[PDB]
Symmetry: C3
Subunit: 173 residues, 3 copies
């Protein structure tokens, strides 16, 4: 399968052209920097409407054939932050270890790391992971979870991905 | 705009007879010691009857206007410990980070911390957090989660709370 | 005077039709024999990755064999057929999130893919059920991390008395 990665930015201010999406860009830069195998990116910037979040994740995995989807934004305690809810709504199997580890590494930086509801799950042969907002916080989580992503994708029948062992080691037991 | 904090002691010995409440005392002492802003306390000692627990929490959040509710008791593996279930039932959004951190910081001193099912969640503009029962554990847990509570309450539109930075630094934002 | 019975279930489509040596199952039974100092019996089962069969097996061991602890190994990854957590959630009335969190945490040290494990733990009557990993190295760190709380958990749910060799692993039992 051709490796396709989705990057979804859930932001009203970004979807309005009001501001630059430093979050999504950070994710795309990260992927380009560490991956050494051929892949394409399906980038989407949408408003924080659970309706549109669920449909976007479904289109990317079902129609665009993404084997991995990385979201950014809408994962805090505020009532409008429904990215986790939308992810649960489209996945058939969740992965608690992802949220646990991401909050773990984020705690070293800020105590409010515990307010994050970021999670991850599976839909068919696609893995969906909720990332943080700040470009430097996204790097921290990615460095922590990327090591297990390519292998997870292998286990769910997704496309082959491999990374620069000098930037991030894709662990494969 | 008034800050009201609920403290609910859930007892597994309402039948055996309660001769003290060191758990409630530990919580009340902590709030008084670290909070520098004006606040009132709605205190409740109730037997561990699921329906009553839910009713009590709803009353405190909806009628008494609490922005924060702290519970102690009924969070172990025994069948009668249903505080977590009751909390889940009245909240619209859960915060996995709280239970994770509380179990993590309590592990070194309490190997059986992994038996605790404490969680935390949101009901409107009120944050509800389950605490352990041992006074020493209550302090350790509150020291770990209080830093993010005031801000979490801001995000859900609750009352303003601030703590003595020389005791506990309420991170904002 | 409740008798202590411990279930050990190796879940695998592969091994279900034959396995020269159940390394994972043996590691677990070896561990129990080494650390436990109180009398106890083992109920061992090898079944395929079939949700309904896993549920029935756990139910049989807890309800019929009177197990106070059931340890499973296998079927806890992200793959479609890995349904041990699903089966476990289905037969338990109360889950213990602390187990899964701690096990992945200790497993993560040598295996970055530990975050893909969906292992959990729950209570069915007076029996505690814990999902362990398949790798011997992971099995050891998980047991070293959770066994200290197992005996006490069993006490709290009305199960059989189990005590471990404090020299290997101390069974933490707080008082009041």
């Amino acid at each position: 399968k051709k490796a396709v990665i989705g990057v979804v930015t859930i932001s009203d201010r970004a979807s309005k052209g009001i501001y630059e999406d430093i979050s999504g860009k950070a994710i795309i830069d990260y992927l380009k920097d560490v991956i050494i195998t051929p892949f394409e990116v399906e980038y989407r910037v949408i408003p924080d409407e659970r309706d549109l979040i669920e449909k976007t994740l479904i289109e990317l995995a079902d129609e665009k054939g993404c084997s991995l989807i990385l979201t950014t934004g809408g994962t805090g305690p505020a009532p409008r932050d429904v990215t986790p809810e939308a992810t649960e709504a489209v996945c058939e199997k969740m992965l608690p270890g992802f949220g646990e580890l991401m909050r773990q590494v984020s705690l070293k930086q800020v105590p409010t790391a515990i307010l994050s509801r970021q999670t991850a799950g599976i839909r068919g042969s696609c893995l969906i992971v909720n990332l943080p907002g700040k470009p430097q916080s996204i790097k921290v989580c990615l460095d922590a979870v990327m090591p297990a992503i390519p292998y997870c994708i292998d286990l769910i029948g997704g496309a082959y991905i491999d990374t620069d062992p000098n930037k991030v080691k894709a662990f494969r037991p």
